Symmetry: C3
Subunit: 414 residues, 3 copies
């Protein structure tokens, strides 16, 4: 009667238990994850490395007759007949110089490679750096490590190598970071007579803020700074931590991955770009690692350059990288004020033995610091551990029928 009528109700209770338990178990086998995000004002924070590059790759006063011979075409300074292009943007003063050192009448070529050309004619930290201060202490060129990029001879402050103890940061604000005054030296910019990958229409510098153990990709990922301004960059360190499989695609940062000691997206890209250029050109660009021969100006103009433009512009399948397990991103907010003021133009002009207009067209101040909330963690965390699954399917087993693994295994037998 009523005792056996709610045994069918018991059949319904079993029917329910089936759907709910298969729910929590499919949910387990989706491997769901959630996010733990903590923005905080840190302490003992490690100051990142700061790489910068002048937008003019070579110095007009340092280009020699041999430099002009080997590389004048790459720089659009000579046509294919080793002469000044008749379609040149004449300057009565500059053109006299160039056609004086473009006179190869008594000239016999001498050995030449691009790395020495960049290292020698590239802008010099010792005459660009007008002022550097970190947390109240003044820097020198000794504190900037020479690094070569596609821009040429570039510099990294707080590179952290050289056994030099990396610098730290405690609070937020300008006084707890870097400030540098620079002269971009527009009077040393090479004439632009055509368009190549080595000349530019812009005056200023390129900057990129990165981990000490992450290489720079300043050509693609950096930001610019204009002459005649003071730029404030308020930063924030964002540490991103991902889960390995099966929860997500994530590569161990101690990656057994060629040219660099640390695995990062940028390093993976530079690796592949190097393999690609060596493979297709038998030639490496000045900034690439490895041991291939550096490209000659003809190899730069004909093979290496379009190879890299292809990799960073058109390629969709050859070169793609995985996500690491640890990634460091730097949020930033930029801001400008004008330099110099009328009250100070004559002061700066006098101090550096330069014209007032020159100061207006070449001088530049850069402040790099962190805000109050200077450190941020974005860590992926597992959302349904196996134990919580067993405890849940357990409260579900016990709910509708009050069974156990003993009751089943024992009752499945006896």
């Amino acid at each position: 009667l009523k005792r056996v009528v709610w045994a069918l109700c018991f059949m319904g209770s079993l029917a329910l238990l089936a759907l709910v338990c298969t729910n929590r178990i499919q949910y387990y086998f989706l491997y769901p994850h959630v996010t733990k995000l903590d923005e905080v004002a840190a302490t003992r924070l490690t100051f990142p490395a700061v790489t910068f590059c002048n937008l003019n790759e070579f110095r007009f006063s340092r280009v020699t007759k041999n430099d002009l011979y080997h590389a004048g075409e790459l720089l659009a300074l000579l046509n294919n007949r080793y002469e000044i292009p008749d379609t040149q943007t004449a300057d009565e003063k500059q053109l006299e110089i160039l056609q004086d050192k473009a006179n190869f009448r008594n000239f016999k070529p001498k050995p030449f490679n691009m790395l020495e050309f960049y290292d020698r004619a590239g802008h010099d930290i010792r005459e660009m750096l007008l002022s550097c201060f970190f947390r109240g202490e003044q820097c020198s060129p000794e504190d900037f490590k020479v690094v070569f990029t596609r821009y040429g001879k570039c510099y990294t402050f707080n590179a952290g190598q050289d056994g030099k103890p990396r610098l730290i940061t405690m609070k937020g604000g300008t006084g707890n970071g870097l400030e540098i005054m620079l002269d971009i030296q527009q009077d040393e910019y090479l004439p632009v007579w055509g368009e190549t990958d080595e000349t530019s229409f812009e005056a200023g510098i390129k900057v990129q803020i990165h981990s000490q153990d992450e290489p720079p990709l300043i050509d693609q990922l950096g930001f610019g700074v204009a002459p005649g301004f003071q730029t404030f960059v308020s930063c924030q360190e964002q540490r991103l931590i991902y889960l390995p499989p099966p929860w997500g695609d994530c590569k161990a940062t101690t990656g057994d991955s060629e040219f660099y000691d640390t695995y990062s997206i940028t390093a993976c890209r530079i690796d592949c770009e190097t393999r690609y250029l060596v493979e297709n050109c038998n030639c490496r660009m000045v900034h690439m690692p490895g041991d291939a021969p550096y490209c000659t100006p003809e190899q730069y103009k004909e093979c290496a350059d379009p190879a890299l433009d292809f990799l960073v512009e058109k390629d969709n399948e050859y070169c793609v990288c995985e996500m690491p397990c640890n990634v460091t991103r730097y949020g930033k907010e930029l801001s400008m004020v004008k330099i110099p003021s009328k009250a100070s133009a004559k002061y700066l002009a006098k101090k550096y033995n330069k014209s007032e207009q020159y100061i207006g067209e070449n001088i530049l101040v850069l402040d790099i610091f962190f805000e109050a909330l200077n450190y941020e963690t974005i860590e992926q965390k597992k959302a349904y551990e196996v134990a919580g699954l067993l405890g849940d399917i357990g409260g579900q087993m016990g709910l509708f029928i009050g069974a156990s693994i003993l009751t089943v295994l024992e009752l499945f037998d006896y």
Copy 2:
């Protein structure tokens, strides 16, 4: 004795179970949610649409005597007596022109509407676009779709309509995005003699980056770009996914919502603004959808303009929109360098048949790209599913008393 003394302890065990189970069940009926945030370097990413507008709405050379007659007051070029205001910012060259075409002695008005005025006098992509490149390929005006905003005749790159396959992006960096050189043509800016909603004190352009299926609100939400700089915009695609009720207020993006095929905040605003202007003015602005008649200059000056200023400035209750279930936000970091350099000014001047000063005051380069971590997901996820509640209240039922639904329903009866 001791057997019946811990039956009171059993009463305490029941007392505990009550509070804990009512805890997990109230917690269920709060409908709590958490967040799943994944910043990643994507692939096959869809490039957004990029809308831009010159800050000068009309071209001084294209304003005709009929255009000046109908609209000269809206542009503060004529007072209420159809004449040059005596309080004009005289220019010996410009004033001769305007008062030459403000001579209505032999003039009889001709038909006129604002849409044709904007379309004709508005700046032209074919003479502003000095250079466009996307991922190594050069663009033409064919790649820019004409869109009308409150600025006038504006343009959208990669609008994605026209059956043109939307463009994709793979890596981070400048080479994997758009770069355009523009001439803002300050020599064609109309004289500003007063303050209206059609004239501006600033030179440059306005830009807004949006989904192909999200309309632009460039007047309110866009950013500016100044002449004489190259601006870098490092972007990041942020996909935001919300939960529908009862977990949150969230509107289905396939919204059955008038003028556009997709529901977005911006489209909802443009919808309501159109209804409002039609209702209160019997008149639609040139950029609004629907089928009302376009406003005459008198309707613009007297009714439509203050109506829209009211909606976008003062309104607090008439026009408010819900949150969609899918939202696309684009993070961005801006950066400038100066253009032109001294080395290149004469080059650019020669190439475009323009003065060096003109190049300094009108020329502008814009790079739009993504960083390495170019894609970000912010998805709301349910925090306490019903199954996990039952499994939990289950481990709680089994803990203190070891009961089941059978034990109760059966014991509640027999």
Copy 3:
């Protein structure tokens, strides 16, 4: 036989239960937390306070002979012998003035304090503010509250004090925020003849956006705005809510913490900086709270200034603050256009009785507003409540052995 052979299997079942239950209980005693992040288009949002400061601290026309006597050395206008430094950046017009009022032949010093000097010579909101509009309504200096910073006499719009109902914001876009036109008055900038903490090489202003009940730290945390541009700041209100111990280090915002009614990182810093300066100098700077005597120019130059530079640059242990439970951060995206255009330069020049060049070097427009997704919540939430632990260890107890607290306590006794 087979009945007693799976009692050893029962021993294995117990072995499993031990590890899994000790897993969920250690997990409980790690006190894990997760994050609830909601970016939304809000309504009835409270507009923050906006503090700004001219980069020139004193006005050259307001510096009197007594002001020059007491403070001329602090400003690098006089050497240690109360005379013009022979290494001055001469200006035939300015130098006549200064050496006219540096003539102390018939001068006897008069009482002097830095607060009155700042208040009097500091730039005036009533002659800098050329235009202010909030949500369609125009502002006056009445809407700006005077606040003193290390820059001097500064101003805060929508300070929210004075019983003035704080302003609200509804939508995203320029029309739903503040726009102001300013003259930085480079013609009133004091000559810079040396480097001190009161003079600057830059022209423009400093801005900081903060809660009405959070003090400004504009020297360290603010951003700059350059003359000759219109700058757009697209903002986003981010409310961060942390967990108190034992889940995290977090201080109650109703903090019983000295000089201010609300606990914030900035207020904690200003508190400690004040204690430090009073302790080490018997002296407070003009912008610090409390009741110590203000510093004399000699105390500024010799003790107070290097004390604060030390605190904001070098200090690593003396002054460090805890994290509050509620923090308000404002995301922002900046953007510039040039001002004035050629079409409008003469207009603005005429309107304000100023030269066209002056307009180009001193005039500045600032728009502060929010984007569509104008409000963001980042709330830490508990990840494993005690009830869910008991329900889980419960489904685990019931799973392997089907026990209960009664079964144990009763069986541990009888």
